[PDB]
Tab-separated table of C-alpha atoms in Angstrom:
chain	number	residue	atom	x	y	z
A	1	UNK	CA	20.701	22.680	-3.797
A	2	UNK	CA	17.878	20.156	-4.441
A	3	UNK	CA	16.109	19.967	-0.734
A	4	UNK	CA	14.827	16.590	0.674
A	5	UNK	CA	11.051	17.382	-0.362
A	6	UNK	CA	11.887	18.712	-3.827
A	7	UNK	CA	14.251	15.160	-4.485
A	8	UNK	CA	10.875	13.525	-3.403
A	9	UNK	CA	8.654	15.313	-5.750
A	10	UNK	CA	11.396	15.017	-8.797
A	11	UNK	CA	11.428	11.113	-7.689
A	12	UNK	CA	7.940	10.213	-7.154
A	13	UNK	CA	5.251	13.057	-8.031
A	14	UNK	CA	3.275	12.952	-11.557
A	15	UNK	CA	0.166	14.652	-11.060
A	16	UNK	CA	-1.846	13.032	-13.969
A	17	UNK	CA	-5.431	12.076	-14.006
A	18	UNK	CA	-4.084	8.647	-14.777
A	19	UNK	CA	-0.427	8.466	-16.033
A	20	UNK	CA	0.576	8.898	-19.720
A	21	UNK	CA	3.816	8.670	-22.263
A	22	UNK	CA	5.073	8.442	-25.596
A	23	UNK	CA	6.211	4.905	-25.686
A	24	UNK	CA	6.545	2.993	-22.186
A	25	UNK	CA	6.311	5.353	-19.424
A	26	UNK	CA	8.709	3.527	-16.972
A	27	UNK	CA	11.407	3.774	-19.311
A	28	UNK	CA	10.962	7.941	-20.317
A	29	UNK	CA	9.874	8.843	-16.678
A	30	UNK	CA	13.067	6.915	-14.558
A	31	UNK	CA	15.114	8.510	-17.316
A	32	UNK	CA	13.432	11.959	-17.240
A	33	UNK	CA	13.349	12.172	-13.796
A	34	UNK	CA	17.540	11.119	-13.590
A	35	UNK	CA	16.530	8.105	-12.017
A	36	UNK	CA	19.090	6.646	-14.713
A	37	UNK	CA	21.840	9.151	-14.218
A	38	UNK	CA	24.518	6.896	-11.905
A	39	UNK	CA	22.970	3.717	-12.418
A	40	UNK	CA	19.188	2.045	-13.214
A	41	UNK	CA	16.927	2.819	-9.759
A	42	UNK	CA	15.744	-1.199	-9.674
A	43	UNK	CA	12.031	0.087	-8.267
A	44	UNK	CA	10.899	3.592	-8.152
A	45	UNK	CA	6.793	4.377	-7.647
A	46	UNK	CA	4.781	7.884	-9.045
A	47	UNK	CA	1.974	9.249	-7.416
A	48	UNK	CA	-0.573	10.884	-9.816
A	49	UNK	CA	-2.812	12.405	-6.991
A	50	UNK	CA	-2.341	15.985	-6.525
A	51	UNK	CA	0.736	17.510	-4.075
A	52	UNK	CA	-1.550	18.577	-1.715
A	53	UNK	CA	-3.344	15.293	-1.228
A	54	UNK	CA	0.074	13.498	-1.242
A	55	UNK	CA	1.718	15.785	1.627
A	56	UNK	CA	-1.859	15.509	3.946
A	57	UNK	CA	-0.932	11.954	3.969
A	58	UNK	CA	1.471	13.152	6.657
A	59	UNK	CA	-1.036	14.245	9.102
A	60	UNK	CA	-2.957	10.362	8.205
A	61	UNK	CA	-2.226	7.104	9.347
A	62	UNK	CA	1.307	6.614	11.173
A	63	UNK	CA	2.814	3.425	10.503
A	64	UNK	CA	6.886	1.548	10.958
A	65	UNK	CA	8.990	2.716	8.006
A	66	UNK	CA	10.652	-0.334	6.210
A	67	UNK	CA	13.922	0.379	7.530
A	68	UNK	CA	12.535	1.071	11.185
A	69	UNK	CA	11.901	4.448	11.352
A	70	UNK	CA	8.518	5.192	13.021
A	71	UNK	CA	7.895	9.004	10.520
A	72	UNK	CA	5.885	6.936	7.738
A	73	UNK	CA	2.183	7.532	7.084
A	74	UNK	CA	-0.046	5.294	5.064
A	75	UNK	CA	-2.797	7.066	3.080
A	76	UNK	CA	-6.579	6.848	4.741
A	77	UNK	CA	-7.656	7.048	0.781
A	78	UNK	CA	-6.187	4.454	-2.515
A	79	UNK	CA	-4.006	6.661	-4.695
A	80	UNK	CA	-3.674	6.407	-8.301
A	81	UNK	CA	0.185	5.307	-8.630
A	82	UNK	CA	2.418	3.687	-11.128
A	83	UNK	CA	5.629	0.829	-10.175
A	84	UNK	CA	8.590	0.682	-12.038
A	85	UNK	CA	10.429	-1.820	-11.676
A	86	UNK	CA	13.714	-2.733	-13.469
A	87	UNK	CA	13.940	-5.909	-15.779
A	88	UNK	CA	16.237	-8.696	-16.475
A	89	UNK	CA	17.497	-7.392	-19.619
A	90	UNK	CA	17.833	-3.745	-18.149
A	91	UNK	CA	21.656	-2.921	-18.304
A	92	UNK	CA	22.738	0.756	-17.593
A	93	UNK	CA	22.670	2.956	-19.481
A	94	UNK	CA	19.716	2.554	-20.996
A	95	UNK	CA	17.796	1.367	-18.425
A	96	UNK	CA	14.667	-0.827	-19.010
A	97	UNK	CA	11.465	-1.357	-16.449
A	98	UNK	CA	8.389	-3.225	-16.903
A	99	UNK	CA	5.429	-0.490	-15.827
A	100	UNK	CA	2.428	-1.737	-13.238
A	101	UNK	CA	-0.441	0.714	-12.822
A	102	UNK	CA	-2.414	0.382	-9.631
A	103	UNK	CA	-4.197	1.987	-7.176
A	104	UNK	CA	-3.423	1.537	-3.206
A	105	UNK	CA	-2.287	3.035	-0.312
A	106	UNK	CA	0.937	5.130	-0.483
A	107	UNK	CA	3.431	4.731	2.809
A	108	UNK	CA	5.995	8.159	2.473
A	109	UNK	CA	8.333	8.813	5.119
A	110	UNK	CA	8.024	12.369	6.383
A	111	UNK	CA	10.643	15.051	7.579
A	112	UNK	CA	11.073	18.884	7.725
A	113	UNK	CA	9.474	21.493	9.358
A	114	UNK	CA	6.975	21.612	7.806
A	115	UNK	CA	6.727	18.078	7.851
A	116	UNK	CA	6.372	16.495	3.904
A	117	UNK	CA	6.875	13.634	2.155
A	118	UNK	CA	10.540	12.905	1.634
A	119	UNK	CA	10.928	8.872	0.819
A	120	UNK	CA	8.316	6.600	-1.142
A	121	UNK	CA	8.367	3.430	1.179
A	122	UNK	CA	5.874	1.205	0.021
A	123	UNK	CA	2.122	0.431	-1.119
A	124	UNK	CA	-0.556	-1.449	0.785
């Protein structure tokens, strides 16, 4: 069974020393990652910094969680990341996104003992 820090790294880690694909890497990466399996994930966000630096954001800066929650942490350092983010023309099930490379702040929600990354909740 696929634990809440492994769904986390299959939804959201590509350590890269920039991000790279084939074609457009929105569309192969939701799709190789079954983010297109039971319908098109609208946004989804990979984090091409190493695990390590990614799970340390947990001991950084603690911030509200969009939903409420108060177990977010917002990176002290800009991470190298990549949005996708469904289009207008997308239909499932071949499910279209237009790609935005940037670098910010990664918010993660964090859970477990040990405590890791579990939910991607935003950039800053």
């Amino acid at each position: 069974k696929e634990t809440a820090a492994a769904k986390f790294e299959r939804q959201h880690m590509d350590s890269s020393t920039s991000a790279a694909s084939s074609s457009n890497y929105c569309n192969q990466m939701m799709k190789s990652r079954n983010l297109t399996k039971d319908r098109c994930k609208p946004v989804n966000t990979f984090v091409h910094e190493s695990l390590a630096d990614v799970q340390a954001v947990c001991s950084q800066k603690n911030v509200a969680c969009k939903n409420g929650q108060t177990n977010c942490y917002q990176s002290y350092s800009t991470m190298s990341i990549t949005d996708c983010r469904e289009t207008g023309s997308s239909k499932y099930p071949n499910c279209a996104y237009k790609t935005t490379q940037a670098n910010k702040h990664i918010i993660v929600a964090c859970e477990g003992n040990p405590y890791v990354p579990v939910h991607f909740d935003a950039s800053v």
